[PDB]
Amino acid sequence: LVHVASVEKGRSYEDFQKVYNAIALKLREDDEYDNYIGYGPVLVRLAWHISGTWDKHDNTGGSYGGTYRFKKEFNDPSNAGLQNGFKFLEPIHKEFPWISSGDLFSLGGVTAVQEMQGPKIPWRCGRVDTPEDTTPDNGRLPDADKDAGYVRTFFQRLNMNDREVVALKGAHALGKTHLKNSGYEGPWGAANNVFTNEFYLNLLNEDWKLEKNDANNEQWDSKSGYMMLPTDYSLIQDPKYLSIVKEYANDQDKFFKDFSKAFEKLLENGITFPKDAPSPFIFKTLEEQGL
Ligand code: HEM
């Protein structure tokens, strides 16, 4: 498979900035979701899950085709709870019907991070909706009950190396696990709708205790009311992941620079960009626009 990026006909930066502004104004307005965390965390999880089905060996899956819109991918057990982010973005797609699905799903992720005080993520347009038979089969997204060797091997399929994996995992400072969605319960930290290096500080500074939860799954719990998944706790069990966790705990700007590079790569995997194509767009926040 080759997937060539094709700009939506006649659209330039200013058009996409209007779709960004619409997603950001609605994030601001629907602040009450999930006990006032808001929709920013489930929108960066949606952008990672439509991207995380990619396989580097045959170029199948990934954000290009916007195939989450189809029943098979939408109803994947690993995607439980993402229907809330889909329902958020659906009025925005009625307002701007020209944008492709993959481009809307991935721009929701970008808008969420930037509006939650995260780094600027460069974004490229050009995903094209592909037919229902290109929808990847279920089971390509990662398990949480596993160790650091699983994590490394999994992320190799998306060709992410160690630095990219630890930077990307730092998005778990956002939101929380929900027992009904995944069999796990609790937040990773206290400021869970502001993007910071808090995941790494909690992982190095809390007194974590291994316990089973109400779904019979193991998780690491701390006195503070926070939790860590087995795959998260893995990052301090592996010697190579642990030196990077410490680096991000001591330097949030290095974490923001690397998270930015890796999250753009993850959203662009599987897509060929012609050099006639526009450069990646940097969108202004509502705040930079006085809106
Ligand atoms: C081995 C890797 C990963 C595993 C096993 C994993 C697993 C999980 C699980 C079990 C949840 C909770 C789902 C729920 O109950 O609602 C979750 C939530 C979340 N994940 Fe991950 N994750 C991984 C990687 C990532 C990456 C790479 C990103 C983003 C760049 C990410 C972003 C999020 C966010 C922001 C949430 C919170 C969603 C919400 O609050 O509703 N995750 N993850």
UniProtKB/Swiss-Prot annotation:
<keyword id="KW-0408">Iron</keyword>
<feature type="active site" description="Proton acceptor">
    <location>
        <position position="49"/>
    </location>
</feature>
<feature type="modified residue" description="Phosphotyrosine">
    <location>
        <position position="150"/>
    </location>
</feature>
<keyword id="KW-0560">Oxidoreductase</keyword>
<dbReference type="GO" id="GO:0004601">
    <property type="term" value="F:peroxidase activity"/>
</dbReference>
<feature type="active site" description="Tryptophan radical intermediate">
    <location>
        <position position="188"/>
    </location>
</feature>
<comment type="subunit">
    <text>Forms a one-to-one complex with cytochrome c.</text>
</comment>
<protein>
    <recommendedName>
        <fullName>Cytochrome c peroxidase, mitochondrial</fullName>
        <ecNumber>1.11.1.5</ecNumber>
    </recommendedName>
</protein>
<comment type="similarity">
    <text>Belongs to the peroxidase family. Cytochrome c peroxidase subfamily.</text>
</comment>
<feature type="site" description="Transition state stabilizer">
    <location>
        <position position="45"/>
    </location>
</feature>
<dbReference type="GO" id="GO:0005758">
    <property type="term" value="C:mitochondrial intermembrane space"/>
</dbReference>
<dbReference type="GO" id="GO:0034599">
    <property type="term" value="P:cellular response to oxidative stress"/>
</dbReference>
<dbReference type="GO" id="GO:0005739">
    <property type="term" value="C:mitochondrion"/>
</dbReference>
<dbReference type="GO" id="GO:0005759">
    <property type="term" value="C:mitochondrial matrix"/>
</dbReference>
<dbReference type="GO" id="GO:0020037">
    <property type="term" value="F:heme binding"/>
</dbReference>
<keyword id="KW-0479">Metal-binding</keyword>
<keyword id="KW-0575">Peroxidase</keyword>
<keyword id="KW-0556">Organic radical</keyword>
<feature type="binding site" description="axial binding residue">
    <location>
        <position position="172"/>
    </location>
    <ligand>
        <name>heme b</name>
    </ligand>
</feature>
<dbReference type="GO" id="GO:0042744">
    <property type="term" value="P:hydrogen peroxide catabolic process"/>
</dbReference>
<keyword id="KW-0597">Phosphoprotein</keyword>
<dbReference type="GO" id="GO:0004130">
    <property type="term" value="F:cytochrome-c peroxidase activity"/>
</dbReference>
<keyword id="KW-0809">Transit peptide</keyword>
<comment type="function">
    <text>Destroys radicals which are normally produced within the cells and which are toxic to biological systems.</text>
</comment>
<dbReference type="GO" id="GO:0000302">
    <property type="term" value="P:response to reactive oxygen species"/>
</dbReference>
<keyword id="KW-0376">Hydrogen peroxide</keyword>
<keyword id="KW-0496">Mitochondrion</keyword>
<keyword id="KW-0349">Heme</keyword>
<dbReference type="GO" id="GO:0046872">
    <property type="term" value="F:metal ion binding"/>
</dbReference>
